[PDB]
Design a protein around this motif. Structure first.
Motif, PDB file in Angstrom:
ATOM      1  N   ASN A 364       0.806  -1.199   0.000  1.00 58.97           N
ATOM      2  CA  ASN A 364       0.000   0.000   0.000  1.00 58.97           C
ATOM      3  C   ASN A 364       0.852   1.267   0.000  1.00 58.97           C
ATOM      4  OD1 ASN A 364       0.621   0.818   2.698  1.00 58.97           O
ATOM      5  ND2 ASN A 364      -0.667  -0.866   3.370  1.00 58.97           N
ATOM      6  N   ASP A 365       0.278   2.333  -0.538  1.00 59.85           N
ATOM      7  CA  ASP A 365       0.944   3.604  -0.629  1.00 59.85           C
ATOM      8  C   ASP A 365       1.779   3.953   0.605  1.00 59.85           C
ATOM      9  OD1 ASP A 365      -1.211   5.743  -2.646  1.00 59.85           O
ATOM     10  OD2 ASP A 365       0.166   4.176  -3.173  1.00 59.85           O
ATOM     11  N   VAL A 366       1.335   3.586   1.792  1.00 59.75           N
ATOM     12  CA  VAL A 366       2.047   4.071   2.959  1.00 59.75           C
ATOM     13  C   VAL A 366       3.374   3.328   3.113  1.00 59.75           C
ATOM     14  CG1 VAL A 366       2.066   4.119   5.452  1.00 59.75           C
ATOM     15  CG2 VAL A 366       0.082   5.002   4.154  1.00 59.75           C
ATOM     16  N   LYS A 367       3.349   2.051   2.779  1.00 58.23           N
ATOM     17  CA  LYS A 367       4.547   1.252   2.747  1.00 58.23           C
ATOM     18  C   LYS A 367       5.473   1.758   1.640  1.00 58.23           C
ATOM     19  CE  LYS A 367       2.481  -3.014   3.316  1.00 58.23           C
ATOM     20  NZ  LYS A 367       2.556  -4.436   2.816  1.00 58.23           N
ATOM     21  N   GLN A 368       4.918   2.148   0.497  1.00 59.16           N
ATOM     22  CA  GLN A 368       5.780   2.619  -0.588  1.00 59.16           C
ATOM     23  C   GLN A 368       6.477   3.936  -0.237  1.00 59.16           C
ATOM     24  OE1 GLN A 368       4.022   2.632  -4.489  1.00 59.16           O
ATOM     25  NE2 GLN A 368       4.215   0.411  -4.660  1.00 59.16           N
ATOM     26  N   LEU A 369       5.684   4.888   0.238  1.00 58.60           N
ATOM     27  CA  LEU A 369       6.186   6.159   0.695  1.00 58.60           C
ATOM     28  C   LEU A 369       7.394   5.937   1.579  1.00 58.60           C
ATOM     29  CD1 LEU A 369       4.980   9.023   2.755  1.00 58.60           C
ATOM     30  CD2 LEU A 369       6.376   8.876   0.750  1.00 58.60           C
ATOM     31  N   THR A 370       7.254   5.085   2.592  1.00 60.67           N
ATOM     32  CA  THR A 370       8.339   4.987   3.551  1.00 60.67           C
ATOM     33  C   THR A 370       9.522   4.171   3.009  1.00 60.67           C
ATOM     34  OG1 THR A 370       8.513   3.391   5.405  1.00 60.67           O
ATOM     35  CG2 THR A 370       6.364   4.467   5.129  1.00 60.67           C
ATOM     36  N   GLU A 371       9.289   3.417   1.955  1.00 59.28           N
ATOM     37  CA  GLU A 371      10.384   2.750   1.291  1.00 59.28           C
ATOM     38  C   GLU A 371      11.187   3.747   0.480  1.00 59.28           C
ATOM     39  OE1 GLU A 371       8.020  -1.386   0.891  1.00 59.28           O
ATOM     40  OE2 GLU A 371       8.739  -0.444  -0.985  1.00 59.28           O
ATOM     41  N   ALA A 372      10.479   4.621  -0.216  1.00 56.78           N
ATOM     42  CA  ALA A 372      11.124   5.733  -0.881  1.00 56.78           C
ATOM     43  C   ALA A 372      11.923   6.589   0.102  1.00 56.78           C
ATOM     44  CB  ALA A 372      10.109   6.564  -1.598  1.00 56.78           C
ATOM     45  N   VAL A 373      11.410   6.781   1.314  1.00 53.41           N
ATOM     46  CA  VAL A 373      12.096   7.634   2.281  1.00 53.41           C
ATOM     47  C   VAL A 373      13.411   6.984   2.696  1.00 53.41           C
ATOM     48  CG1 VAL A 373      11.991   8.533   4.681  1.00 53.41           C
ATOM     49  CG2 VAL A 373      10.220   9.095   3.037  1.00 53.41           C
ATOM     50  N   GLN A 374      13.375   5.671   2.877  1.00 52.53           N
ATOM     51  CA  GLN A 374      14.571   4.925   3.215  1.00 52.53           C
ATOM     52  C   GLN A 374      15.609   5.067   2.132  1.00 52.53           C
ATOM     53  OE1 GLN A 374      17.236   3.570   5.233  1.00 52.53           O
ATOM     54  NE2 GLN A 374      15.112   3.730   6.033  1.00 52.53           N
ATOM     55  N   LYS A 375      15.190   4.877   0.903  1.00 52.78           N
ATOM     56  CA  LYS A 375      16.110   4.834  -0.187  1.00 52.78           C
ATOM     57  C   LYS A 375      16.719   6.222  -0.369  1.00 52.78           C
ATOM     58  CE  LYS A 375      15.945   5.989  -4.831  1.00 52.78           C
ATOM     59  NZ  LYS A 375      17.210   5.431  -5.398  1.00 52.78           N
ATOM     60  N   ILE A 376      15.887   7.258  -0.332  1.00 53.14           N
ATOM     61  CA  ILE A 376      16.398   8.621  -0.375  1.00 53.14           C
ATOM     62  C   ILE A 376      17.310   8.924   0.841  1.00 53.14           C
ATOM     63  CG2 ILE A 376      15.764  11.079  -0.353  1.00 53.14           C
ATOM     64  CD1 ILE A 376      13.164  10.300  -1.894  1.00 53.14           C
ATOM     65  N   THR A 377      17.009   8.330   1.984  1.00 55.35           N
ATOM     66  CA  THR A 377      17.783   8.627   3.176  1.00 55.35           C
ATOM     67  C   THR A 377      19.197   8.107   3.034  1.00 55.35           C
ATOM     68  OG1 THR A 377      16.001   8.882   4.749  1.00 55.35           O
ATOM     69  CG2 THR A 377      18.085   8.116   5.588  1.00 55.35           C
ATOM     70  N   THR A 378      19.330   6.857   2.577  1.00 58.75           N
ATOM     71  CA  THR A 378      20.626   6.263   2.310  1.00 58.75           C
ATOM     72  C   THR A 378      21.391   7.069   1.270  1.00 58.75           C
ATOM     73  OG1 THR A 378      20.023   3.999   2.841  1.00 58.75           O
ATOM     74  CG2 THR A 378      21.817   4.299   1.328  1.00 58.75           C
ATOM     75  N   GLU A 379      20.730   7.418   0.186  1.00 59.20           N
ATOM     76  CA  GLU A 379      21.410   8.209  -0.804  1.00 59.20           C
ATOM     77  C   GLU A 379      21.983   9.507  -0.203  1.00 59.20           C
ATOM     78  OE1 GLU A 379      19.779   8.963  -4.756  1.00 59.20           O
ATOM     79  OE2 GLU A 379      19.545  11.051  -4.217  1.00 59.20           O
ATOM     80  N   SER A 380      21.254  10.179   0.697  1.00 57.93           N
ATOM     81  CA  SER A 380      21.761  11.456   1.227  1.00 57.93           C
ATOM     82  C   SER A 380      23.010  11.235   2.031  1.00 57.93           C
ATOM     83  CB  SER A 380      20.772  12.147   2.153  1.00 57.93           C
ATOM     84  OG  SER A 380      19.698  12.660   1.416  1.00 57.93           O
ATOM     85  N   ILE A 381      22.982  10.212   2.868  1.00 58.48           N
ATOM     86  CA  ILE A 381      24.154   9.955   3.668  1.00 58.48           C
ATOM     87  C   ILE A 381      25.364   9.733   2.750  1.00 58.48           C
ATOM     88  CG2 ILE A 381      25.216   8.355   5.326  1.00 58.48           C
ATOM     89  CD1 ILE A 381      22.244   8.353   6.519  1.00 58.48           C
ATOM     90  N   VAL A 382      25.177   8.963   1.692  1.00 54.10           N
ATOM     91  CA  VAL A 382      26.286   8.775   0.782  1.00 54.10           C
ATOM     92  C   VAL A 382      26.727  10.113   0.221  1.00 54.10           C
ATOM     93  CG1 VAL A 382      26.982   7.998  -1.454  1.00 54.10           C
ATOM     94  CG2 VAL A 382      25.845   6.408   0.063  1.00 54.10           C
ATOM     95  N   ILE A 383      25.790  10.899  -0.272  1.00 56.00           N
ATOM     96  CA  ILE A 383      26.197  12.092  -0.989  1.00 56.00           C
ATOM     97  C   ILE A 383      26.605  13.273  -0.108  1.00 56.00           C
ATOM     98  CG2 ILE A 383      25.557  13.854  -2.642  1.00 56.00           C
ATOM     99  CD1 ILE A 383      23.953  11.866  -4.063  1.00 56.00           C
ATOM    100  N   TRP A 384      25.906  13.495   1.003  1.00 53.54           N
ATOM    101  CA  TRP A 384      26.140  14.697   1.792  1.00 53.54           C
ATOM    102  C   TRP A 384      26.573  14.381   3.202  1.00 53.54           C
ATOM    103  CZ3 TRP A 384      21.309  14.536  -1.064  1.00 53.54           C
ATOM    104  CH2 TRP A 384      21.382  15.205  -2.292  1.00 53.54           C
ATOM    105  N   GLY A 385      26.521  13.117   3.592  1.00 57.85           N
ATOM    106  CA  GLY A 385      26.860  12.749   4.969  1.00 57.85           C
ATOM    107  C   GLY A 385      25.846  13.180   6.028  1.00 57.85           C
ATOM    108  N   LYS A 386      24.647  13.586   5.598  1.00 54.99           N
ATOM    109  CA  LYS A 386      23.536  13.770   6.516  1.00 54.99           C
ATOM    110  C   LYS A 386      22.159  13.489   5.872  1.00 54.99           C
ATOM    111  CE  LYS A 386      23.502  18.608   5.405  1.00 54.99           C
ATOM    112  NZ  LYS A 386      23.127  19.980   5.820  1.00 54.99           N
ATOM    113  N   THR A 387      21.131  13.268   6.691  1.00 53.23           N
ATOM    114  CA  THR A 387      19.808  12.996   6.150  1.00 53.23           C
ATOM    115  C   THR A 387      19.106  14.338   5.962  1.00 53.23           C
ATOM    116  OG1 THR A 387      18.527  12.962   8.170  1.00 53.23           O
ATOM    117  CG2 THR A 387      19.795  10.975   7.674  1.00 53.23           C
ATOM    118  N   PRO A 388      18.224  14.442   4.961  1.00 51.87           N
ATOM    119  CA  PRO A 388      17.504  15.668   4.671  1.00 51.87           C
ATOM    120  C   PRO A 388      16.266  15.763   5.533  1.00 51.87           C
ATOM    121  CG  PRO A 388      17.247  14.015   2.881  1.00 51.87           C
ATOM    122  CD  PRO A 388      17.833  13.330   4.079  1.00 51.87           C
TER     123      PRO A 388
END
Ligand SMILES: NS(=O)(=O)c1ccc(NC(=O)CSC(=O)N2CCCc3cc(Cl)cc(Cl)c32)c(Cl)c1
Lengths: 558, 405
Positions: A364-388
């Motif tokens: 369901n959308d709510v599970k997808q949303l938070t999966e996207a948040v995880q994936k974006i969160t990991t990407e930020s740490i890689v790129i900027w060293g902090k979460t947005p």
């Protein structure tokens, strides 16, 4: 070309393995001659050395002409030595993303002349690099050389070169903390915030330092000018962006044109928001040959079209300012497709991206949303060293309801609701309690492992009853079927009791879309309903009406 | 100090484990720590010819600003298991779980003054990554016994013994057990005396360099599966009561449902109350009577792994079971709480591990009800122990959750 005086990196073959000894095939005389000319030049320059036939090792040499030209190239086939050389540490574990670079006042690109040859090879190793230019026909022993620098195509060269370049830069860095140098292959990216003044000066100091270690590089008027193309991007003084993308004008599409298209769009989506690809992908599944034409679906068309629209005219990304925040926004784009932008200052994007992945069969959308948040969160740490800080299309309340009751543990860094439809919401709630004065359905399903025929049905408690047959099903299928019936024949309020932990599981999760057609129908039912209560009992324990719906669907099946 | 020789388990070699990305603050913290150990000779930079890797992290440890370094040698430990376990294995005292009080003492500073066998150091490589991959990772290996490697305490065993010999001699009735970087010290003393004995023992350690936090084992009794009492029993309630009852056996030798069961026959409304036959109450009570009893017939088997499952229960509560063979629980319990889901899960995981260390002297393999990426990105934010257990990720069966409510 100089040969860096720097310390050597000790190298070993793999335990219980010995150097190569693959025989040299006979060559034509022109080939033989070309190699002699190539080798004695390399020998003069120190790059190689002649050896006796006491050394027992050998690697094939070949010689090819020239794509167009009229020089000769020498090819040494290090496959065998390569399979016998130790493993090294991975060269570079990821590549910076442009959206993560800090802005510099001034930046210049240097490249090393003849990287590999400029650096020495562990002495105790050279012997294994033996090769042999043969004489004319068998007769005569061939001429025999071995390497003193890093050979082209040997397994250790990329690692040791780069390892060398680090060793050599370390100090200069030390006494220049405010200048960043990025190493990529045999390029250096050098930026600082000094006025052109002793930027060039400082550049010069770098060059000398390099030249002092046997490493030579271009000089002003020799160095690339911006935008520096790289790794597919375009780097500018004040922005970055992906390299030019062109979606070909085309009457007919082959698998191969579409594969390429999908690849350019994906790449484009790091900075062009809203790029879509689903319809195009849909085409590829169950594929035929590369040369096969595929008729463009109508959705695929609207999709291609809306994509040309987006690409119509340039978009760029900004660089990163560590003294400001990171905001990430996400929009639901539809059929399991999510889109996002990251910026620091409202609407001047550092980068964009999309997330689609189907994670599971039912979701369901709510599970997808938070999966996207995880994936974006990991990407930020890689790129900027902090979460947005997140901005999401979902009420705090909805989120709170869902997280709180879900079995699985969850979390999300700092966020705030933002009102951009489509909003994310749960499309139905199961009851916590049995509903008084709503009909209880006791449902059940059974399938014959042999015939694959199945019965599915129910018995309520106002004496209603029904049993359907199914011809190529499974237990899992008959049990969804049975629940689907009970939902078809009950109207706005109903209690349902199954002995299928399987269906229970799926349904308790509030799926709002599935790969199963059946599970979808079940969903439109659940949404039409007004108060559904679902509950489980263990099957084959003479129990409620369960025992009846059981015998009902068993008669015939098993 | 002549070093002891350490070899891998034949026909397999060193760890090549990937380094999770780290945030800027943890990287900086790691650069300091690492510049220092290097100056002091604990570790040295290595070159590209070392292909090994072990991940490294930064944590805090309960009530502390000082960042501290944590190396994940899970992989290395598997690969040298034969060494630390059955060659230099450390016996584990069955008595420990008995004591009224167990204090746990960090003692890993001991290790940095014993040099590491030169031929093994390469297997301890690790990397400090950099943000956005702008620069190559800083790469190091150990010259001395590293914290978190199961080899260290195995090797340091006999020194530990010399250090503890006086204190032991003087306190025949205190048990001291070492596990990885920690010391477990348990006694039956009043708590003032206990705390006093631990101070006394801190002074001994203090004479060899080494430089508490309090458990009370003998009072870790059961989390008995509970059935409801209540006057009035709906069709639904009974339905649920037999589901739970039903599941309960399979582990509980001779649970009964027949009587209870009869109550439901035909196809009634769910919301319909029904009386009871007091022989059904007979089951209930015995069941209950049983449901509070040590599993009959289940025993630690030292040659098998320990497994832990954890279910989320809402309202800050978590249940868990340790076992080696499904439904043969060696132990069950709950953990209870500005605390999110991941934070609490991390706490429960640690608590269970340390119980598991006290009781069996080995840590369980955990089945975590959480999505890999979330766990991996978050756990160090709250982790405080100096070891790390193994873990998988899973989806809780819907029923398990209530059958342990
Ligand atoms: N010399 S200049 O025309 O004034 C000029 C200034 C800044 C830039 N760009 C930037 O300020 C950000 S990028 C940059 O400085 N660096 C150095 C740090 C790492 C790195 C890595 C890569 Cl791949 C490319 C660049 Cl161009 C860089 C450019 Cl492309 C040109």
């Amino acid at each position: 070309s100089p040969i860096s005086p720097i310390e050597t990196v000790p190298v070993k073959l793999k335990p219980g393995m010995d150097g190569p000894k693959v025989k040299q095939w006979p060559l034509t005389e022109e080939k033989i001659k070309a190699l002699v000319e190539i080798c004695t030049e390399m020998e003069k320059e120190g790059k190689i050395s002649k050896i006796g036939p006491e050394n027992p090792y050998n690697t094939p040499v070949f010689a090819i002409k020239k794509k167009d030209s009229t020089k000769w190239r020498k090819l040494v086939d290090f496959r065998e030595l390569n399979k016998r050389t130790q493993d090294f540490w991975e060269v570079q574990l990821g590549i910076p993303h442009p959206a993560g670079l800090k802005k510099k006042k001034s930046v210049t690109v240097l490249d090393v002349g003849d990287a590999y040859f400029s650096v020495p090879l562990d002495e105790d190793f050279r012997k294994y690099t033996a090769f042999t230019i043969p004489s004319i026909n068998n007769e005569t022993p061939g001429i025999r050389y071995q390497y003193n620098v890093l050979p082209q195509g040997w397994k250790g060269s990329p690692a040791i070169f780069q390892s060398s370049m680090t060793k050599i830069l370390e100090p200069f860095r030390k006494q220049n903390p405010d200048i960043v140098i990025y190493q990529y292959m045999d390029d250096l990216y050098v930026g600082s915030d000094l006025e052109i003044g002793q930027h060039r000066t400082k550049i010069e100091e770098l060059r000398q330092h390099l030249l002092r270690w046997g490493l030579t590089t271009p000089d002003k008027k020799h160095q690339k000018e911006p935008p520096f193309l790289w790794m597919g991007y375009e780097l500018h003084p004040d922005k970055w962006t992906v390299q030019p993308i062109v979606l070909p004008e085309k009457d007919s599409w082959t698998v191969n044109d579409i594969q390429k298209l999908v690849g350019k769009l994906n790449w484009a989506s790091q900075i062009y928001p809203g790029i879509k690809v689903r319809q195009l992908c849909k085409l590829l599944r169950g594929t035929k040959a590369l040369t096969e034409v595929i008729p463009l679906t109508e959705e695929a068309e609207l999709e291609l079209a809306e994509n040309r629209e987006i690409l119509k005219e340039p978009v760029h990304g900004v660089y990163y300012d560590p003294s400001k925040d990171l905001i990430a926004e996400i929009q639901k784009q539809g059929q399991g497709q999510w889109t996002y932008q990251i910026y620091q200052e409202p609407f001047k994007n550092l980068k964009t991206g999309k997330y689609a992945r189907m994670r599971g069969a039912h979701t369901n959308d709510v599970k997808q949303l938070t999966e996207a948040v995880q994936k974006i969160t990991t990407e930020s740490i890689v790129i900027w060293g902090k979460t947005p800080k997140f901005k999401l299309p979902i009420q705090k309340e909805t989120w709170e309801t869902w997280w709180t009751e879900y079995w699985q543990a969850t979390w999300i860094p700092e966020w705030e609701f933002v009102n951009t439809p489509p909003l994310v919401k749960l499309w139905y709630q199961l009851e916590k309690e049995p509903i008084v004065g709503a009909e209880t359905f006791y449902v059940d399903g059974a399938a014959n492992r042999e015939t694959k025929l199945g019965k599915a049905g129910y018995v309520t408690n106002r004496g209603r009853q029904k049993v359907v047959t199914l011809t190529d099903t499974t237990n899992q299928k008959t049990e969804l079927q049975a629940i689907y019936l009970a939902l078809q024949d009950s109207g706005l309020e109903v209690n349902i009791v199954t002995d299928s932990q399987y269906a229970l599981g799926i349904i308790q999760a509030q799926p709002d879309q599935s790969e199963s057609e059946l599970v979808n129908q079940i969903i439109e039912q659940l949404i039409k309903k007004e108060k559904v209560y679902l509950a489980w009992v263990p099957a084959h324990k003479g129990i409620g009406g369960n025992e009846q719906v059981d015998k009902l669907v068993s008669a015939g099946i098993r | 100090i002549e070093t002891v020789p350490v070899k891998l388990k034949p026909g397999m070699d060193g760890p090549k484990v990937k380094q999770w990305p780290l945030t800027e603050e943890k990287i900086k913290a790691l650069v300091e720590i690492c510049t220092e150990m290097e100056k002091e000779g604990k570790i040295s930079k290595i070159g590209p010819e070392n292909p090994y890797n072990t991940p490294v992290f930064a944590i805090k440890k309960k009530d502390s600003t000082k960042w501290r370094k944590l190396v994940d040698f899970r992989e290395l430990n598997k690969r040298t298991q034969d060494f630390w376990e059955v060659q230099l294995g450390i016996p584990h005292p069955a008595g420990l779980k008995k004591k009224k009080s167990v204090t746990v003492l960090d003692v890993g500073d001991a290790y940095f003054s014993v040099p590491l066998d030169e031929d093994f150091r390469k297997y301890t490589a690790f990397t400090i990554p950099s943000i956005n991959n702008e620069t190559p990772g800083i790469r190091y290996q150990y010259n001395v016994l590293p914290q978190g490697w199961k080899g260290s305490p195995a090797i340091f065993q006999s020194s530990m013994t010399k250090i503890l010999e006086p204190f032991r001699k003087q306190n025949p009735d205190i048990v001291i057990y070492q596990y990885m970087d920690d010391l477990y010290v348990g006694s039956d003393l009043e708590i003032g005396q206990h705390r006093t004995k631990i101070e006394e023992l801190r002074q001994h350690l203090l004479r060899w360099g080494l430089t508490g936090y309090e458990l009370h084992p003998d009072k870790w009794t059961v989390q008995p599966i509970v059935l409801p009492e209540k006057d009035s029993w709906t069709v639904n309630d009974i339905q649920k009561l037999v589901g739970k009852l039903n599941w309960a056996s399979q582990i509980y030798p001779g649970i009964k449902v027949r009587q209870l069961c009869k109550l439901l026959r035909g196809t009634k409304a769910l919301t319909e109350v029904i009386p009871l036959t007091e022989e059904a109450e007979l089951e209930l009570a015995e069941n209950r009577e049983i449901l509070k009893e040590p599993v009959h017939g289940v025993y630690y088997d030292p040659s098998k792994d320990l497994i832990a499952e954890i279910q989320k229960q809402g309202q800050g509560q978590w249940t868990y079971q340790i076992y080696q063979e499904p439904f043969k629980n060696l132990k069950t319990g709950k953990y209870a709480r500005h605390t999110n889901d991941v934070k609490q899960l991390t706490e429960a995981v640690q608590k269970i591990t340390t119980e598991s260390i006290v009781i069996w002297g080995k840590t369980p393999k955990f089945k975590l009800p959480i999505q890999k990426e979330t766990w991996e990105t978050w756990w160090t934010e709250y982790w405080q122990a100096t070891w790390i257990p193994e873990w998988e990720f899973v989806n809780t069966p819907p029923l398990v959750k209530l059958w342990y409510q």
